[PDB]
Design an enzyme around this catalytic site. Structure first.
Site, PDB file in Angstrom:
ATOM      1  N   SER B 200       0.825  -1.205   0.000  1.00  0.00           N
ATOM      2  CA  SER B 200       0.000   0.000   0.000  1.00  0.00           C
ATOM      3  C   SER B 200       0.862   1.259   0.000  1.00  0.00           C
ATOM      4  O   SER B 200       1.625   1.493  -0.944  1.00  0.00           O
ATOM      5  CB  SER B 200      -0.955  -0.011   1.197  1.00  0.00           C
ATOM      6  OG  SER B 200      -2.062   0.845   0.981  1.00  0.00           O
ATOM      7  N   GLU B 331      -9.274  -5.318  -4.225  1.00  0.00           N
ATOM      8  CA  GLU B 331      -8.543  -4.181  -3.683  1.00  0.00           C
ATOM      9  C   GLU B 331      -9.457  -3.150  -3.037  1.00  0.00           C
ATOM     10  O   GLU B 331      -9.025  -2.424  -2.131  1.00  0.00           O
ATOM     11  CB  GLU B 331      -7.720  -3.523  -4.788  1.00  0.00           C
ATOM     12  CG  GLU B 331      -6.495  -4.306  -5.187  1.00  0.00           C
ATOM     13  CD  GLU B 331      -5.391  -4.201  -4.154  1.00  0.00           C
ATOM     14  OE1 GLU B 331      -4.372  -4.905  -4.298  1.00  0.00           O
ATOM     15  OE2 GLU B 331      -5.541  -3.409  -3.198  1.00  0.00           O
ATOM     16  N   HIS B 444      -7.788  -5.644   0.666  1.00  0.00           N
ATOM     17  CA  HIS B 444      -6.535  -4.898   0.702  1.00  0.00           C
ATOM     18  C   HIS B 444      -5.734  -5.237   1.951  1.00  0.00           C
ATOM     19  O   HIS B 444      -6.207  -5.049   3.075  1.00  0.00           O
ATOM     20  CB  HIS B 444      -6.861  -3.402   0.664  1.00  0.00           C
ATOM     21  CG  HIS B 444      -5.682  -2.506   0.440  1.00  0.00           C
ATOM     22  ND1 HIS B 444      -4.974  -2.481  -0.741  1.00  0.00           N
ATOM     23  CD2 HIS B 444      -5.126  -1.555   1.230  1.00  0.00           C
ATOM     24  CE1 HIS B 444      -4.016  -1.575  -0.661  1.00  0.00           C
ATOM     25  NE2 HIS B 444      -4.087  -0.997   0.525  1.00  0.00           N
TER      26      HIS B 444
END
Ligand SMILES: COc1cc2c(cc1OC)C(=O)[C@H](CC1CCN(Cc3ccccc3)CC1)C2
Ligand SMILES: COc1cc2c(cc1OC)C(=O)[C@H](CC1CCN(Cc3ccccc3)CC1)C2
Lengths: 540, 540
Positions: B200, B331, B444
């Site tokens: 990330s 995601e 995610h």
């Protein structure tokens, strides 16, 4: 002489002719005058009914083709010349044809009325692929088809003026529908069961008859094959129609420099020109390089069409109406050889990326550069953005979706959601005798020969499966004409054709295989054309 | 007494701790100071190297977490708490950690350097899912991870000024990379084989080190997990960074009522505020309602980033670089419960069409109404435009493609086409112990625990196949760290992982099944975000 080849209609007597089919004879009445010849001062004017006649009009052969452009793209090629005039050209062309079973029906029989396509610039009821002898023999239906004025003679318009009001070719079709009402019973036909069917510009004509109240009373069902009145080609605005008519006048010397100006002097000058001279300049009045765009088409003037087709479709109540609509598998491929760069019927048309980007502007004229970018985005496969075969199929999809598939889906969904019972199809069989190249697939217009049962012609080389397939299609069209439902009225063995609804969007595939049900007429692609692209054109 | 738990670095001596794994021990040195504590006058300023120290610094436990917002969305929930700080908060937080195999490597060993994510507002190297003991034991590499300043303390920026230049959190990471160069050999690590990997915002950080020349010399390979420096959230403009910093000052009473507000007086007033006070107003400076947007992120100032990441990616020469990039299967789903209407982790989140249309504006903030229309066009199933399950998955795709998948795809293609060797993956295994609801899929951040071999922890309830799966992944990551190629240098029987190229766009799926090769990282969806949408916003 056979007594059934003589018929009296309101204007006088007729002598028809007996046509042979492998299954039995049919009585045909070819070349019935339904209007006064629209010649001289009548050029550009609405039709007048044919005055009654003495004696026996011979109705044994097709009459003249209305003056129209003749396609010279591939001279001597079967694929192009099968659509060209097969009778001599004349402004004396407002004649219709009636096929009726033998023996003549004693009970009122449902009536099919064919309206030929051809971009509103060409076409004729005398074309071999419109031969109604097989449909009438196999399904015991009365079939009618008329000639209507095309090109400048049918659709040149100076809006508002009395000398060239426009849409007179559509009025020709209406007058023929009034004639069917007053006379089809003499042939055993039921004027209370009249089903319209047409292809391309004929389908668009059928749609415009749904949207015109004076025509809507003359029929009860509709079949729109590969065309819709809401298409980007089927109508033009008043200002553009006036500009095209004025430029045509200029190209033929009207008005004589420099005396003239008003619409009266302009049409009067146009009326003195030989018909072939007007035809010879028809294409030069198109505003841009394009394909699938035609110079003189129905005009949105407030008379025949009180509003745009899209507006009338949205505001329309269609309860009590049954509609059959459909498309062919490759609506766009045919048009690409008429202007899209890199295309040729005599090679594989494996175009380059640059040729694709140029073809988009020819296939979608008069869109902003941004709108063309959205088209490229939606129709490029970004895993293979340079693959020639995929680019060829993509440009075919662009032209076909923009001009046929998505206007048809927009119409079919609005009709079903507003009271009409709709059935939808996609024609997916490529005729074994098709002369166009294999990369074109199932091109625009090549379902017609199966609807009319041409494979049954013993002098043609169709396969045995295509003969059975043609009979199944004629049954679908006839069942829809009789009952409003293409399905066999009681046969439960055959697979069923579900209606098309705005929600489920069910349609069937028509090929040699049994019916197969699918959902969505290119729903993703047609959301781009119907929903997003207008919003993009608004905020320029 | 184990002498290998004693190490001398350039600043002094350290005492580490031995960590147990089911396969053997590991030597860990947790909490090594690499910078002077950035406190008092040092708040908002670039880090300074840690001055040398006397005696033995204890490095047996993690140091403090940098001051950051604590997530309160689902108090007591494992899924949210696992990312919250697990050590006391402090501005005295610039410490790094080194894991090394037991026995210590005698030959220089390749080094993995972990950079945690957390939107540049949160995160810590001490989190349980970043425990490096299993990766180091199983694959015999040296693992380093650092803490870096987040939120206002790392990325508040008044561009141009010297008191708050911005990007100091990135400089913290760089200083830790300089430390690795000067000291990792003492732990058996090879400073000539350093692989950065992060997830990330950590992946975005790794990318920004590729594009910054002073950092580019401190490492040799990059791994970007579910993040890219070119994301819409990873950078902010100078004008907007100044507005956010000024509004934060206003919310904490800076400057006092009736006081000039040049950059010096503003930062000086900000430095007098307790750290918790700045944190308590961090989210209030975001410009509109959104998800996946963070207040203080790297600023495009011209110093650390001489141009925008996108500009530097396009103009960059990446010959000699090996990159491993990838994404998780879902995601976007994680972010929807932080602001998208109708979403909740405790129900099925079966949103209505109206909630979907509202969620698009939250998931894609700062775009025109026409841009949102294009997003709705591309992400609606127009055959089922009202189905709540499909709308739920569509909004997840909107947020995930816009924020992660398409920025990563654009980066991967530009890298491979401009000299870098690239490998791409999609992580498709949902952990058996995952506490988030099933509709979120593979959310995610939930590949990290497999990359770090957390399933090998005896105190956890992972399945036997997840333990084997974790070992495959650590092998892939270590092989890439050693050689630049995740493929087994020995085993030819195992399925091969082909490089990612701008043309073929090949990637592999990572799950319990053997490697499967696929093509295109959502090529159609990412052409909308990367190619069309910028053109659409330019024409407004
Ligand atoms: C002479 O110039 C032009 C001529 C044409 C175009 C553009 C032109 O200028 C650019 C077109 O776009 C036309 C393409 C159609 C012509 C007729 N056929 C056959 C057909 C007829 C009736 C029903 C169904 C199919 C299909 C394609 C012709
Ligand atoms: C409190 O206000 C807000 C808080 C958050 C948002 C918006 C907010 O205001 C709208 C977000 O969009 C955030 C969502 C992330 C929070 C942390 N997790 C976990 C994670 C951490 C680190 C790496 C990977 C996953 C992923 C989603 C938080």
């Amino acid at each position: 002489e056979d007594a059934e080849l003589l018929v009296t209609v309101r204007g006088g007597r007729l002598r028809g002719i007996r046509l042979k089919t492998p299954g039995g004879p049919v009585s045909a009445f070819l070349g019935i005058p339904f209007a006064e010849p629209p010649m001289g001062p009548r050029r550009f004017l609405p039709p007048e009914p044919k005055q009654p006649w003495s004696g026996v009009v011979d109705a044994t052969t097709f009459q003249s083709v209305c003056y129209q452009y003749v396609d010279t793209l591939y001279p001597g090629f079967e694929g192009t010349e099968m659509w060209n005039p097969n009778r001599e050209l004349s402004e004396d062309c407002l004649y219709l044809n009636v096929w009726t079973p033998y023996p003549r029906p004693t009970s009122p029989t449902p009536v099919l009325v064919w309206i030929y396509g051809g971009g509103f610039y060409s076409g004729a009821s005398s074309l071999d692929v419109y031969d109604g002898r097989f449909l009438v023999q196999a399904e015991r239906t009365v079939l009618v088809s008329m000639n209507y004025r095309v090109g400048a003679f049918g659709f040149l318009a100076l809006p508002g003026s009395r000398e060239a009001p426009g849409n007179v070719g559509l009025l020709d079709q209406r007058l023929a529908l009034q004639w069917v009402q007053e006379n089809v019973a003499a042939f055993g036909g039921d004027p209370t069961s009249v089903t319209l069917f047409g292809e391309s510009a004929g389908a668009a004509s059928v749609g415009m008859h749904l949207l015109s109240p004076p025509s809507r009373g003359l029929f009860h069902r509709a079949v729109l094959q590969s065309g819709a009145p809401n298409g980007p080609w089927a109508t033009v605005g008043m200002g553009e129609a006036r500009r095209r008519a004025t430029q045509l006048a200029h190209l033929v010397g009207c008005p004589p420099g420099g005396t003239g100006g008003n619409d009266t002097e302009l049409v009067a000058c146009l009326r003195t020109r030989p018909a072939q001279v007007l035809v010879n300049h028809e294409w030069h009045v198109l505003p841009q390089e394009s394909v699938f765009r035609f110079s003189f088409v129905p005009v949105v003037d407030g008379d025949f069409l009180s509003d745009t087709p899209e507006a009338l479709i949205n505001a329309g109540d269609f309860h009590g109406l049954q509609v059959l609509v459909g498309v062919v598998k490759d609506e766009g491929s045919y048009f690409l050889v008429y202007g899209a760069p890199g295309f040729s019927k005599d090679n594989e048309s494996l175009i380059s990326r640059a040729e694709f980007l140029a073809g988009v502007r020819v296939g979608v004229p008069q869109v902003s550069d941004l709108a063309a970018e959205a088209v490229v985005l939606h129709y490029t496969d970004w895993l293979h953005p340079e693959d020639p075969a995929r680019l060829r199929e993509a440009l075919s999809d662009v032209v076909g979706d923009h001009n046929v598939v998505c206007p048809v889906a927009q119409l079919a969904g609005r009709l079903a959601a507003q009271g009409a019972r709709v059935y939808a199809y996609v024609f997916e069989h490529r005729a074994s005798t098709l002369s166009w190249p294999l990369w074109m697939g199932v091109p625009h217009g090549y379902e017609i020969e199966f609807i009319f049962g041409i494979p049954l012609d013993p002098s043609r080389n169709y396969t045995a499966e295509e003969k059975i397939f043609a009979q199944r299609l004629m049954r679908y069209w006839a069942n829809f004409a009789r009952t409003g439902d293409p399905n066999e009225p009681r046969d439960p063995k055959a697979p069923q054709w579900p209606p098309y609804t705005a929600g489920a969007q069910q349609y069937v595939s028509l090929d040699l295989r049994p019916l197969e049900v699918r959902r969505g007429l290119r729903a993703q692609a047609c959301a781009f054309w119907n929903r997003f692209l207008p919003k993009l054109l608004s905020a320029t």
